[PDB]
Amino acid sequence: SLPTMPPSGYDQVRNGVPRGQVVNISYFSTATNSTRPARVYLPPGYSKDKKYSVLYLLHGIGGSENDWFEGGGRANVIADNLIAEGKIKPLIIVTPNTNAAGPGIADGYENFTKDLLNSLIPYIESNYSVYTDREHRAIAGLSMGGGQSFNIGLTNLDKFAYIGPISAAPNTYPNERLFPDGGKAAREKLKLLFIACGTNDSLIGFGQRVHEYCVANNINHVYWLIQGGGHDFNVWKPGLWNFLQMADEAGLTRD
């Protein structure tokens, strides 16, 4: 069953496994009034004749859109291998720069909500062959990125049906702000809420309180703790490996 600890080699390049391509892109953001960078993972065999689902994967504080790839996440390798094992269908993974800083910006990480929704998503949808409905859009991330996944995803259930916060940081909104309707929309529209963290992580308390709220308010979700896990990729990689499969099972890649 899932979630579970991944098998050795899940994150290593395997001989004979088709590799997707990671491309660097830039887009104009009305949120920052500047050109912003991002990376896009195109699955092996990517073709404009078919539509793909999209996962927006967010990095941590001070990080970049490279963190989830050669920065330690190895997201492309993990995805490549899962596709080859028939555990997930191909999908596009977008890694943005989560600090939408700019002129007169109070909080760049908060400003990122507008950047993602009004600039990045529209750019991706007009430049790649993808579905544009909530049932084919997921959001996940680590630390500050996990906090943004909670924040953006739960307050925009009309746009995301799968949410995966890993080791969510303090920027995570209070429970009342994440579920202003007592969890009505979450129970009926959210296909997957995957919360994961290492037990040795100092920030464990944030995902923990969201989990406690979901239990008390009967909100279905998956809470997974990696025993002895720290604030590092030895927790974030297994988190992604599991999220990809669970989101796929939940319908993320449904035709």
**How many chain residues touch Pt ion (CB under 5 A)?**
3
- Cα(158)–Cα(49) distance, rounded to whole angstroms? 27
Nearest distance, CB of residue 130 and Pt ion, angstroms = 30
Q: Decide if 197 contacts 168 (C-beta within 8 A).
A: yes
What is the three-class DSSP state of 180? coil
Lookup result for tokens 């919360």: 195
Strand, coil or helix: 51: coil
Question: CB of 168: closest distance to Pt ion in angstroms?
Answer: 11
Q: Toward Pt ion, which CB reaches closer, 81 or 99?
A: 99
Give the residue carrying structure tokens 């009505």: 184
* 8 A C-beta contact, residue 214 and residue 193: yes
Among 17, 25, 61, 117, binds Pt ion (CB under 5 A): 61
By CB under 5 A, what part of segment 164-193 binds Pt ion? 169
Nearer to Pt ion, 59 or 74 (CB): 59
Task: Please name the residues in contact with 237: beta carbons below 8 A apart, sequence gap of 6 or more.
Answer: 6, 10, 11, 72, 73, 74, 78
Q: Which is nearer to Pt ion, 110 or 135 (CB)?
A: 110
Per CB under 5 A, the segment of 9-17, 54-62, 117-125, 134-142 that binds Pt ion is 54-62
Task: Give the nearest distance from C-beta 170 to Pt ion in angstroms.
Answer: 6
State which residue, 53 or 99, has the beta carbon closest to Pt ion.
99
Binding mask 93-132 for Pt ion (x = CB under 5 A): ----------------------------------------
Q: Which is nearer to Pt ion, 61 or 185 (CB)?
A: 61
**DSSP track, 96-112:** E------TT-S-HHHHH
Residues lying near Pt ion in the complex (CB under 5 A) are found at 61, 144, 169
